[PDB]
Scaffold this active site. Structure first.
Site, PDB file in Angstrom:
ATOM      1  N   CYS A 197      -0.150   3.920   2.587  1.00 33.72           N
ATOM      2  CA  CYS A 197       0.202   3.417   3.922  1.00 33.72           C
ATOM      3  C   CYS A 197       1.678   3.663   4.205  1.00 33.72           C
ATOM      4  O   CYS A 197       2.050   4.176   5.268  1.00 33.72           O
ATOM      5  CB  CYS A 197      -0.072   1.916   4.020  1.00 33.72           C
ATOM      6  SG  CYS A 197      -1.807   1.432   3.811  1.00 33.72           S
ATOM      7  N   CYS A 254       0.827  -1.199   0.000  1.00 35.41           N
ATOM      8  CA  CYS A 254       0.000   0.000   0.000  1.00 35.41           C
ATOM      9  C   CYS A 254       0.870   1.261   0.000  1.00 35.41           C
ATOM     10  O   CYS A 254       1.520   1.573   0.999  1.00 35.41           O
ATOM     11  CB  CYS A 254      -0.911  -0.017   1.236  1.00 35.41           C
ATOM     12  SG  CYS A 254      -1.944   1.450   1.428  1.00 35.41           S
TER      13      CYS A 254
END
Length: 117
Positions: A44, A41
């Site tokens: 993230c 991600c």
């Protein structure tokens, strides 16, 4: 791994369902921020330093890191459909926040903390 770099002592990796519940129970009345993230991600990964700084600034908040890719059944059971995602929990009140945020919208996480200190 990127999610281990400069992570403070109130940031814990969750690797099992039972450990997750034990952490929530052992937190007592403390605010618990559950960080659902993915290995690949990008958002993230990008927001991780800010998350680490937030944890350092709030040593009494418990941060549980849950890697979706390594805990898929757990995350699906919790209705986590997109990453990054956050659940906040606090004592008797149980779940008190559930939201996503952008890298640039990190202030939403700070606002959520301020609603519960």
């Amino acid at each position: 791994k990127w999610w281990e770099r400069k992570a403070g002592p109130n940031m814990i990796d969750i690797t099992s369902a039972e450990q997750f519940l034990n952490a929530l129970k052992d937190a007592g009345d403390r605010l618990v921020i559950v960080d659902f993230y993915g290995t690949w991600c990008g958002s993230c990964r990008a927001m991780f330093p800010k998350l680490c700084k937030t944890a350092k600034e709030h040593p009494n908040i418990l941060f549980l890191k849950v890697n979706f890719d390594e805990n898929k059944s757990l995350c699906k059971s919790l209705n986590v459909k997109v990453l990054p995602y956050f659940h906040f929990y606090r004592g008797a009140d149980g779940q008190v926040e559930s939201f996503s945020c952008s890298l640039a919208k990190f202030q939403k996480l700070r606002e959520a903390i301020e609603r519960h200190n």
